[PDB]
Design a protein around this ligand. Structure first.
Ligand SMILES: [K+]
Ligand SMILES: [K+]
Ligand SMILES: [K+]
Ligand SMILES: [K+]
Ligand SMILES: [K+]
Ligand SMILES: [K+]
Ligand SMILES: [K+]
Ligand SMILES: [K+]
Ligand SMILES: [Zn+2]
Ligand SMILES: [Zn+2]
Ligand SMILES: [Zn+2]
Ligand SMILES: [Zn+2]
Lengths: 370, 370, 371, 371
């Protein structure tokens, strides 16, 4: 009852995000090439390197990624999508996958399989009881990829591949995916839209990405009606809003649902220094969010909780946000956040009326979780 | 009555911001070295290169920076501060100047003089009527440096050196400094605190940086009481809030004061993609802010307006925010913002109640501007 | 008698997209990890430009705007098929490799290739008219590997050949010389003017460095052009002594024999002591002396009409000082030391070795065939 | 008879702060522009580590944790004054240059220097006991330029000498050999063991590349150590043929004459064809053959006890493949091609030139003095 799994694969740091900023470089638009795309793998690699350099790695059980099979991927995705990803992976320089901001390098399907497979392998080992919990520091991310496409830097929906494995292979009847990446988990929402056996929750900045989704009225359909929960929050929301959302909506939803496994889509792009959103969460905020969620798992599903890396785009600060979560898993709290004092005076630590109201909009939906 | 000055010096791109993220790299804190400090000069250089590549440079009059003299600097700063900057500039690898986030490279005083001097030289040429207006794309920035210190990446207060020159050398009785960098212009506020001959205005994110300043109650002292105006805005404020602040506070303040010259501390760190603040301004927002301010100058001080670069930390997006301002100066609107559609759906375009109220707090202070 | 030195830099020369590979593209199956800076990344040449400015040399130069090379300009050196193929790759959403697997063109990159060739043309025009006495076109992408019908070795169009073709067809010059001291064989230039005695083509290079199968002393042109191509392959490790002996024994005598009306220098700095893409030992003082000699030769034989056009060089650290030395020889304002001078001076290359002397002496009997 | 190959990598080896200069610090008066990647930046060696993992070689290796070198460990190779001076610079808020103007230590960087020396020690311990048959310590910062009383040439402590001193004093070995094939002269190692015949020190290097005044064949040790230091200076442009001739004629016979109980290899890859900091032409296949020969020699004379310790190498592009070749010779699993092989193979270096042969033959008469 205490052994914490940790997945990193070298190839997670070799994802080729190209020479553009977001979309590709384009001379006619006068978008100058740049060395580091916003989604460049160094951000997540720096998190891995801090896990090692901090000494946290000594308290973790390293777990090798095992490449996701076609069968694994097909539990979350269409055969057509999988076949299309094989095609672009073959291109001599890779290329965009569909949406104009989602570059796959040459041979990049290998990395996408290892990323989904890292989530699956950790899930397997936690669910069997070999491990009590873990963190899969994967790349590329997953939560934007719906059933039939790649989208928003995501090739396959890692957490959904892992949930599908938990359902079909491990025979779990109820799984929860809690996504706190600052962007709406539209892919995950899509995949399990009609399905009450995977409760999908997304805490995000309202309309940050994608532009047309993540409204509280998006609640699933058919037998899945009531088993998708969006918590859109306003720009500028910080630790107070995020913790109020955890206490009023997320944790009660999990307790109502009684999942046999909790998977956390753990992005750190809600951080105070992220370029790709406008939120004010600090490493201490993420710490408290993780502590609450792990304690919830202890109470309702024998501690079975798997964290899977989603987004986050500050190479400076993301490592300390991620380390705080790892420390809550290991219980070894051995390094300060060196930005703590600098960021703590910027605010986000008072629950504003507009933040409170956004969260309260979701509370009446809890009663529909049977 | 139409000739637009433009200052860039190669050395503005050679500022040595070190190997840290914000503070220096530190092994005991496990702050890993990184190639690009948040304040790395490539951000501003990319703006310069876009000015050239877009063809805007063909509509601009290039103006060489002339190094600020000791006498120039002393109109804004103490002799002790100037002498201290000579000392750290001599260090073999340079070093921090005081506050732990303000690195000067070896020989870096040369660049700091050229940065202040770029502001002065443009000011001189606009004020004499050789030029109608201009943009000084300087680096290092200025607005955090108070009378007796360097602070927040700023060695000398460029806009205050330029205002002091306009006062003492050109004999102007009234100058305005309008700072729309997202961080509080505490340095500028300090320098002219007791002085009604330089009206200092700062539109900023409340308590973003520095942590203890920029409150609406900071209004100057003695004869300068009423001649400093802070407009702190909440995190998440976008184009609607910024334009409401321009229309309700900034432009009326300028009209009340009747400056003979307007200097704009033109930062783009309020942009939607900036890591160092939480605001939602787009290039079209900055465009409208610039258009309004230039038109105000046409109405009240014969078009005499000088823009001087302050902060901004998105190498991806800052160039397009800066280009929009340049286009409003030249009147040649020849390149789209390629991020426009991507960013426009994220919000910030509706004036929220909390934003409106923050701005309305400053309106009663307009009556004290004589 | 006149002194005005032209200088071409265009912002877009620094925006060339060399991709995320090292040399070829990144490739996961081969386990070639992506990297930020390709060997040929534009920062190397941009750092040279920035040093020209920061050193104060720019104050002694006459800035000359690049004018995009027209289709007609390009067709004086290249086939219509090559030009049309470059339009195709330039249109791709992320650009792509042109023919040879190491020559990436970015999206819209044809614009930069036209400005690069056009920079060489515009400087050539203004020197030839006498507006300028001489100049330096700090262009990018480079040119000398591109033959008539292809892109090759980071080169889209052969800038110096476009400029020579302009000097021939538009300015009516009967004799032009292209002296290429890039460390790699100027195979493109050799190819373009192979049959043509009106452009004397000379290449000083490391033997078999790049391309693998060319630059032998036996490659001398054909037909009426026989004798009007001169290769000077030198052994790896050759330094200042060898390069200067080659200038004195072969290059300068060749130019004097030929009596060009204009000298175009393919000015690469990849023969430098710190270059990753060759094994030569030339220092900034070596390049200085090479430039001084060539400029003085131009003064003697073609009224000072000399145009330098940037080719290769891959040390972002040291190339700027090698380039600055050449600029200083043009302006006559020698105001900055090479800060690497003492560090590099003890490594050698300053004695003419027997193998180096012999390699150079192989070319001397060919001088008599230059009529 | 046993086969288990140790491998040392520590995350902090990739965190060495080489600063914002190219070689020396950035300097505005000299107009040396700041740059992101110093020549010695840790990404080069990290890319080697990442390729070891991504290639699947890591699956055939036994990972061995670095253990920080103690003061006592360091003092077997260095003075107390040097150790104390390194504590001082490590304490500086942004670190700083150590003695020589090109050797930057970051803030807290002594921690990494201890882990680097300690990685060499720990691998040496585990090979010597027979737990492991051999191994590779991919350490950083490097060691071989650091003499007894100073840091020099990117080196804080002399890792291989700390390891040899441990093998002598703690493991009681009477004879150890250090074979340094970094392209720069191992002057530090030479200095440390100058008077001492119990550590045979051999350096194959480019003549006068770095440092400027050392590595001559006449530098042979002193007193009881006379004859127990062997320098093999080679000319610029030397490639696989020269390096292998040096191995066969000098290095391997020296080791056989000496009968070390342990062989430590100072394994640099800065002799590679693409290195900016030297002018040699060795390819990954060259390094492969050098490693195979040395490992086979160890098998014959000291029960296979061979420890490789990373020294220099400055091509982030190519070093990983040179290093991988050596790892493959240790594991016997030859599963990835050198993707540069065909590109580099035609550049030369594969014929033994007369000057190269003569440089090597100068050392052969010194073999008889190794008793
Ligand atoms: K669902
Ligand atoms: K989310
Ligand atoms: K004031
Ligand atoms: K402000
Ligand atoms: K010819
Ligand atoms: K050549
Ligand atoms: K010895
Ligand atoms: K050596
Ligand atoms: Zn996200
Ligand atoms: Zn700012
Ligand atoms: Zn070349
Ligand atoms: Zn070396």
């Amino acid at each position: 009852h205490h052994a914490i799994g940790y997945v990193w694969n070298t190839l997670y740091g070799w994802v080729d995000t190209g020479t553009g900023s977001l979309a590709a470089a384009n001379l006619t638009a006068r978008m100058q090439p740049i060395s580091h795309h916003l989604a460049h793998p160094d951000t997540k690699r720096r998190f891995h390197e801090l896990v090692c350099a901090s000494g946290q790695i000594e308290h973790l059980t390293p777990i090798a990624a095992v490449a996701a099979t076609d069968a694994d991927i097909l539990r979350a995705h269409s055969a057509a999508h999988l076949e299309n990803m094989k095609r672009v992976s073959n291109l001599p320089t890779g290329g965009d996958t569909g949406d104009g901001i989602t570059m796959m390098g040459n041979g990049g399907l290998e990395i996408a399989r290892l990323s989904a497979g890292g989530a699956v392998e950790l899930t397997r080992r936690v669910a069997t009881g070999e491990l009590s919990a873990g963190y899969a520091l994967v790349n590329p991310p997953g939560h934007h990829a719906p059933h039939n496409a790649a989208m928003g830097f995501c090739i396959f929906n890692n957490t959904s591949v892992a949930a599908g494995y938990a359902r079909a292979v491990l025979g779990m009847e109820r799984v929860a995916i809690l996504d706190w990446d600052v962007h709406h988990g539209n892919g995950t929402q899509d995949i399990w839209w009609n399905d009450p056996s995977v409760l999908t929750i997304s805490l995000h900045q309202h309309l940050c990405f994608p532009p047309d989704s993540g409204y509280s009225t998006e609640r699933g359909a058919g037998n899945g009606h009531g088993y998708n929960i969006n918590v859109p929050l306003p720009p500028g929301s910080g630790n107070a809003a995020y913790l109020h959302a955890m206490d009023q909506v997320v944790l009660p939803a999990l307790r109502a649902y009684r999942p046999q496994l909790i998977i956390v889509g753990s992005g750190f792009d809600a951080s105070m220094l992220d370029p790709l959103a406008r939120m004010m969460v600090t490493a201490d905020g993420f710490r408290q969010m993780a502590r609450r969620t792990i304690d919830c798992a202890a109470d309702i599903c024998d501690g079975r909780i798997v964290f899977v890396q989603e987004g986050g785009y500050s190479p400076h600060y993301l490592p300390f946000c991620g380390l705080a979560v790892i420390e809550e898993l290991t219980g070894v709290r051995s390094l300060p956040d060196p930005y703590h004092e600098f960021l703590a005076g910027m605010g986000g630590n008072t629950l504003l009326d507009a933040e409170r109201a956004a969260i309260e909009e979701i509370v009446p939906l809890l009663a529909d979780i049977r």
